[PDB]
Structure 1
């Protein structure tokens, strides 16, 4: 390998223009967030990773951006999800009431983008960016999602819902973002119940009996939060 050769795709083409345009469009769907200066938002985003080594990013790097993208969503209307992105977002696009992280400004900005800096320059690396597994874990994208997913989980309250893919071999994966960051940052003072919606892909079983679901229950119970689980048998309906 050569210096700064990473295994992952490079920064999304036209990433600066895309983030700015997404901030502009979000400010229009959500009159609550028109107080946001989108050029300031982008500057803070760029400042989090530019000129920094893309294997050495910190949560504090994103703190200016978290401040400018601070957004109050009803803490009792949070939808977490794991490995069922399409249905989770179609669900909140109908409800319009419930919020996934991608329905917040910061999640919307970053959704499906990749980015990283060419260290020791002020330039964006369009050639490759670190892969979390093969290259390094503290890369600009992974650190961003770890930090905003933790803050999203920390803000939830009352009954927190999580949509899970029942057609998977690991319905609950302790190593996912949900299993490794979000579930452990639910605050028992604010959160009374974690309710899992296990979406079936035809499986007549009670997937709340699945061993990974029982594993999730044990994690939740040890945090002094109650657990609830429901089968959703016909995702269509």
Structure 2
């Protein structure tokens, strides 16, 4: 895979942009300066083989980069990236990891270490499946763990309820591995939103299948639980992109 060009410059540019201008009324500023964050980030992977990573590698980076998250507004998602982000609305209705500083800085970027100077590969990175799971997941898994550990109040989790191939909730998804296990007792409720894409056969429903497994796990952690399928506000978002869908017929 081809890595992001001028990694340090893009990291530092996003970092400065975010610091001064992004999410000002939504998320707090971090204490560390961008240059300090860059040092922590770079030390996690640099001068190592590109697969030489584990869930602890970026611990210091996430420590420095982690913001306090607004109560009741934290959102998680599995399988529905675009809908979840669209609904969250860039921080206005919910927060996603991509609205947080480390999320915003590294969103969509590709990088990897190497042993020789300059300690990272500017030409080429291994396909992600060639490394061990703990290396593949080192960055975004720690990102997701640190974010989950910071959540307070009600959290929302949006899942795909129309994928015949992947359960709406899986123990081995990022939410199952790094999200739910890391929710602290500051969390009070998990609110699940089941997305049924328009025109697709409904596969999973609240109170059944993997969603019932999830309900039981959430209750066992002493969180309250609720679950809704295509609630109106979400249905309207889907309809905006497919207004002639049967489900979108206006009175």
Q: Same fold (TM over 0.5)?
A: yes
| 1:185 is aligned to 2:185 | no
Q: Does 1:148 align with 2:143?
A: yes
Counterpart for residue 5 of structure 1: none
How many residue pairs were aligned?
A: 227
Q: What is residue 3 of structure 2 aligned with on the other side? A: 11
Which structure 2 residue ranges, 5 or more long, are not aligned?
Answer: 240-251
Decide whether the 8 Å contact of 1:75 with 1:155 is kept in 2.
Answer: no
For residues 219 and 20 of structure 1, do their structure 2 counterparts lie closer, same or farther at Cα, with a shift above 3 Å needed?
Answer: same
8 Å contact kept, 1:55–1:138: no
1:164 partnered with 2:156:
no
**What is the deviation of 1:106?**
0.5
C-alpha displacement at 1:115, in angstroms? Answer: 1.3
Change (3 A) 1:74 1:120: same
Structure 2-normalised TM-score? 0.80
CA distance in 2, matches of 1:86, 1:155: 23
* Runs of 4+ residues over 6 Å off in structure 1: none
**CA deviation string 1:115-155 (max 9, x = no partner):** 1111254332234434454432233x620111111111111
Distance 1:68 1:135 in 2: 26
Counterpart of 2:230 (choices 213, 229, 232) is: 232
The whole-number CA distance in structure 2 between the counterparts of 1:134 and 1:204 is 34
What secondary structure sits across from 1:150 in the alignment?
helix
Q: Which residue of 2 aligns with 1:221?
A: 219
> How far 1:162 sits from its partner (Å)?
0.4
Q: Specify which of 60, 64, 82 is matched with residue 60 of structure 2.
A: 64
**What secondary structure does 1:16 align onto?**
helix
Aligned to 1:3: none
Deviation at 1:94, TM superposition (A): 5.8
Tell me the CA shift for residue 15 of structure 1. 2.3
Residue 123 (structure 1) aligned to one of 119, 129, 134: 119
Instruction: Quote the Cα distance in structure 1 between the aligned partners of 2:84 and 2:105.
Output: 18
Deviations 1:11-30 (A, max 9, x none): 22332222122112211214
- 1:35 shift after superposition: 5.1
Note closer, same or farther for the CA distance 1:97–1:82 as it changes in structure 2 (3 Å cut).
Answer: same
Does residue 114 in structure 1 map to residue 110 in structure 2?
yes
